[PDB]
Structure 1
Amino acid sequence: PDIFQQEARGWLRCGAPPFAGAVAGLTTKHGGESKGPFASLNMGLHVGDDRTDVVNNRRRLAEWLAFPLERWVCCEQVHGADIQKVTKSDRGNGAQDFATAVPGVDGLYTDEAGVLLALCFADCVPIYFVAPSAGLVGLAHAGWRGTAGGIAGHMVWLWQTREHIAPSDIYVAIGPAIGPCCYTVDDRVVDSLRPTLPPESPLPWRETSPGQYALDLKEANRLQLLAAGVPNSHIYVSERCTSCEEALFFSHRRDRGTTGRMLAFIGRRE
């Protein structure tokens, strides 16, 4: 069974055992207030939807999780590889007004309880991190650009060098994202990813016609995490494709660029 399992409402819980001490999951597209291409549980404030509808969708998740919206922390998600540590003093940033989101970063982490890290997705890879003994949680957004920038390994490096956590103490869930079944890219994308993988590494793409590659970004990020020292048995990977599973997910690719966003979230209850 997939590591992300359907709950009673419009969300999937991360069921990997090391995440049992955390509130961790990904929303699905149903149960909200938004309309048209955003129907209905659009969590993204940056996609041209009605802000009142989106805030109400966020308040609905907050009720399902018993984790108030005033305790969430969001980031700008610029498709880079930068990451910021956040604390209770950052609560609310980007929760109801996109302009207050943490600027210039694509991942967040915290060692405090009572802080819900909250990032938006509709094909890019959500990477959830936990160090259960040390009380750290993290969440990163990795499309091809962030993966080429090594965002996954950057989280591990920060936890090692700034938080004094060995990679062997980290566990990771790679959530629903677009699969190689649906994601075809050109030489420039794969050429950007090549230097981020070990020289002996199997390549997470297949050339399906000249200059066209079926790309597996989940696997690219898993390989980077392995190279950064996270143990194989600590990395859980969802098999759900956001483009294929149209009944559950918004997909930037399938929906031709105008669609909602799911929210990936992780935090610990205070």
Structure 2
Amino acid sequence: SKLIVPQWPQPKGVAACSSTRIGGVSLPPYDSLNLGAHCGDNPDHVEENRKRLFAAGNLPSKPVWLEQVHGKDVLKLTGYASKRADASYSNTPGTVCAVMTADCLPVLFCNRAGTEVAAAHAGWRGLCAGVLEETVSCFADNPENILAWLGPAIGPRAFEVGGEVREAFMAVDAKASAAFIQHGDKYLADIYQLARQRLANVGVEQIFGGDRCTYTENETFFSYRRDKTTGRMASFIWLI
């Protein structure tokens, strides 16, 4: 399948999907459903892949792509001065929030009532810096009414990092030590657990997903760590 549908108690007024590498037209190293236009692929192929995926996902409009910079800024999708941001927020029907990834954690959010949605691109830098709390801060609803879906990311068996990454996280939130295990001179990091921690700090505990690994599941996902020059997937959410 070209896409995954989040397994969460999705409100009737919300739609969401997350793409795989399967079912497009690109050739290696972008094989096949590469959505990224700035990673060296044949641009005709990328355009075709986007057409295929947007049709498969029944997107009502084109996604509002961001100029992702591995920061913590959120674009409120008001209908831009700048799209330099790593998350977006919408309360407008038909507006599609999207983040593009190939290892960095996508997080999709909505409220139980189905009146607000958001998408965050939470690579370790952005996650550490507070992109998830920034995104949550945009919601009008109460925190216990926010649902968060952890999309396909590089998982804890493959995401090896140096001690400086562990230090960066622990400097914000000491609990972060629980999300690393030592491997020689490095650490294996659980980005999912880090997300759960940082969201729990802001009262968001209804968390779903977190069961995939972009690195390990190579027939299903692109992985920057695995392949360096490769394609991108994306995660999408909208109010119907």
Give the TM-score normalised by the residue count of structure 1: 0.84
Aligned to 1:250: 222
Give the 3-state SS of the residue equivalent to 2:166 in structure 1.
helix
Identify which of 176, 194, 206 aligns with 2:170.
194
Pick one of 235, 238, 259 that aligns with 2:210: 238
Letter matched to residue 245 of structure 1: E
Match among 94, 112, 128 for residue 114 of structure 1: 94
Q: Residue 111 of structure 1 contacts residue 137 of structure 1 at CA under 8 Å; is this kept in 2?
A: yes
- Residue 141 (structure 2) pairs with residue 165 (structure 1): yes
Indicate whether 1:57 and 2:49 are aligned. yes
Distance 1:201 1:42, change over 3 A: closer
User: Is 1:31 aligned with 2:23?
Assistant: yes
Per-residue CA deviation, residues 202-253 of structure 1 (Å, 9 max, x unaligned), is: 521111113x00011111011000011113xx11132110001011000111
Matched residue of 2:119: which SS? strand
Q: Distance in 2 between matches of 1:152 and 1:21?
A: 23
CA shift in 2, pair 1:125/1:200, >3 Å: closer
Closer, same or farther: CA 200–27 of 1 in aligned 2, 3 Å: closer
Tell me the residue number matched to 2:183: 208
Shift in alpha-carbon separation, 1:200–1:188, aligned structure 2, 3 A: closer
Distance 1:135 1:11, change over 3 A: same
**Shift, 1:185, TM fit:** 0.5
2:178 aligned partner, one-letter code: L
- What are the ranges of 5 or more consecutive residues in structure 1 without an aligned counterpart? 1-8, 91-99
What is the distance in 1 between the residues matched to 2:237 and 2:30? 23
- Counterpart of 2:188 in structure 1: which amino acid? A
Residues 202, 187 of structure 1: alpha-carbon distance in 2 compared, 3 angstrom cutoff: closer
1:18: how far off?
3.2
Name the SS for the 1:37 alignment partner.
Answer: coil
Note the aligned Cα RMSD (angstroms).
Answer: 1.8
| Structure 1 residue 71 displacement after superposition | 3.2
Q: Does 1:85 align with 2:65?
A: no
Q: How many aligned positions are there?
A: 240
Question: Where do 4+ consecutive residues of structure 1 move more than 6 Å?
Answer: none
C-alpha contact (below 8 Å) 1:170/1:230 kept by paired residues: yes
Q: What is the rounded CA distance, in whole Å, between the counterparts of 1:263 and 1:152 in structure 2?
A: 17
Structure 2's unaligned 5+ residue stretches are: none
